[PDB]
């Protein structure tokens, strides 16, 4: 696989292994802990159905090299939108200026090692015919419109990416990945008596578009998701004012795992903890969540959107237990922060592209299942909210305040789910909210393949998950 | 302008090459290219942390044939890469469906002779010079008060860009621009509570920036003001959006009056054209041609001329924000809003921030908001908030871990006043805004 | 920057 990627990224651009040696040597003229060369090429396609027609399509290409020079806290970085010897030389000569002092020049010999394959190397853009791709969108349109007469508009989009990466470093790392990513997105508008609402569904992962035609609980996945978007739109159309204030909230399984992404996940990224700016800094071994809570970041999940066969530093993805039975175990790392903390890489060194710096980032972040049934959880609430779906969230990792906003929610009254309620932003303190988790369900699932995470302006594909769970007290941003 | 004028020539030639390649095989085409160059540096505790050299290029084309469209892009501007990009878009357009609202912008609306808006003020700032600016800002913040116990650093950014647009009606125009900024962000602690805040300065010319020492002082002041907040109890109260978030409050209007939302009936303002949606004394002026303006532009992303307009005049919604496609969907003409709005100005009604606090008497000031929480189609509003509780016309304590909720239609219609404390670092510029009531969720 |  490294051989195949090397042929496309190096040989095809007039580069050999010995050029990697030369360029790393240019970096190592300076007094550095580490330097790396990051090569990338990618292809993105999209198709969009709207107004019952194939309205739009795009094809986008990028390629480039990024070069870093690191000394302690410091990074010098330059990059170019081309893969060539001259681009590499120019980028190295700029990056290394981070330190004036000469180094000993003693790099480690480049040597690749095997890692577990997590996803195909088959290019998703070429593996299905154009008309077969467009037929997925046509089927979504037909099914959504047939699902309810109130459906007036359907926008359905297919996106696919095929990405090659290769990384070479002064510590001897030589590693490559072949990364497919597909997503089907559906949005519907419903109208009744002049009132309108919208609903959405979709997902995907690291494989070809055939996934969208495969079986999901006895139906074609694309059909199921078309129907889900309509169902969501109709629930919203019927929704009444949400209540305001502090109350019990039961969160559904899957994407409501945004809770974990915001309440602990960023707060456990090693850059914030190394600097001491996270609320979690210095807290390893302390209770940061209820004893019912084990939270992992897992880059090893076959075929998943959030997984990393290797991270962008060449570290194979790992199953990292962050919190175990409420107790903080450790932090997600990149090479830089791991060194400064006296720790080891974890497989969390991610960058949006060759044109951006890596940092510690999430992969698939989820809570392990517990002993309660979802029914037992709902029945425990006299008055509160049940929220099976969310939009996004946000976190201030210093003050430990986070939010996440519902996309489908209901009252619970006397242990039963009742009236649908309008979207509300929920707010809490991360640690305190995790400590309020009093019941954990036996129904873990991850999201369908929809997560995008933003940090320092860099967007990445991620996963979240959890079982159904109960937070005893959470502030609900309703009006009623 | 040596390096920039060399880039500009290369970019103009790439646009002309792409258009010529497309012309025999399409009824129309649009091409956009850019190049952005500069430096981004950070400091930690006054020492260099990161030095990043930026160099980004891009070409995008859209083609049209039989009212079918296709797009492609590349960061490689070699003749062979341009050829492949043009072919890729043509190939897509063979398979998309005819859609008569698609196409190159109307010739009569194009900026064939686009105005010079004086957006380009280059500086030769070396990495070491940049580092010292950032360090000065950060150091000034860190030395302000002994409760400042950590840092997220100083930052300095300086970039220049060139953009060129062309289409098959024969428009080919480009312009250069610069942006420089300086910031710092520090952390304060009291009784186990940590808080973070930041200050910044931004401008098109280096000589339009505040001093590093100003940035640091402002960063420290903001950070220290956040210490030891209270979580309010659930209530109804008046709300002031401080200037820095008030701009965003008006910003929600953009999506609500966007032609793409209007033709699809996906906005809560669908039936509000010509209606009074804001107070009768409130006018929102758009000024796309301000010299050196932060969001000035000589033409929009479809090459269409930009115009001085009052989007809201005496509380009345006067127009939608249209692009070529949405205008055609509505039987109207583009208003030059492809790529967004171009400097909004809302005058103060005479009161300072202090006077607004006295007018309100008791209520909440919001200075930071979190989450999305705004429904495009209903106007429903629910966001996380931080700021200050006010009583007796005086700030009493900071607050956090609360939400504010209501609906944009009611919020906008019943604005009490807008302050003279105008935020001048943004696209939309206004002072603080007093609303008579929101639902605050907390304890 | 903000963190999502
Ligand atoms: Na493995
Ligand atoms: Na032609
Ligand atoms: Zn995130």
Residue numbers in the entry:
A (entry chain A): 2 to 481
B (entry chain B): 8 to 450
C (entry chain E): 601 to 604
Structure paper excerpt:
Using a combination of biochemical and crystallographic methods we show that E. coli TldD and TldE interact to form a heterodimeric metalloprotease. Peptide substrates are bound in a sequence-independent manner through β sheet interactions with TldD and are likely cleaved via a thermolysin-type mechanism.
To explore the substrate binding site of the TldD/E heterodimer, wild-type or mutant (Glu263Ala) TldD/E was co-crystallized with a variety of peptides and peptide mimics, leading to four distinct ligand-bound complexes. In the case of angiotensin II, the density was consistent with Asp-Arg-Val-Tyr (hence WT-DRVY), indicative of cleavage at the central peptide bond of angiotensin. Using the standard nomenclature for protease active sites, these two ligands spanned subsites S4-S1 and S3-S1, respectively, occupying roughly half of the active site cleft. WT-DRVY peptide ligand was refined with occupancy of 0.7.
